[PDB]
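Subject: mismatched residue count in predicted assembly?

I count 154 residues in my input, but I want to confirm that the predicted structure covers every chain. Input:
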Amino acid sequence: SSTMGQVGRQLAIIGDDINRRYDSEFQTMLQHLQPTAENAYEYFTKIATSLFESGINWGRVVALLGFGYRLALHVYQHG
Amino acid sequence: MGQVGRQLAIIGDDINRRYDSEFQTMLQHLQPTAENAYEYFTKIATSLFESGINWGRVVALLGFGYRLALHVYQH
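Triage response: the counts match. Full output below for your records.
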């Protein structure tokens, strides 16, 4: 009924679109890095630094968070 | 490293370009104020996760929560 439920379902469309666009693209970059528990932190901070030197918006931040989630999940499963 | 950081910049800019106006439209229908920003965010998040959780939905929630907080701060 209320707007909250309509907005919540609209965000599912946004969230699934982001998830479907870039989840396989995050995994491709992890295959190239092959990060491990010993170097996941250094990889992520220099990836983050290289991202923010060219600008910062909320889209860049959420992209980095998504990649950091996949990277950590990758390390946990392949490390 | 260099390409990973540059590709996430393209992705992040595309995400920012693709959905920012959709967040503004949601805020104008909610007409939120400081007093009820919590109630709106908490209920929206409930509706979002009724149909499942994935990182794409969580980051969308955060990008909207940041727009909501930014909108509330102006008023």
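The two ends of chain A are 47 Å apart (CA to CA). Marking this ticket as 'not a bug'.
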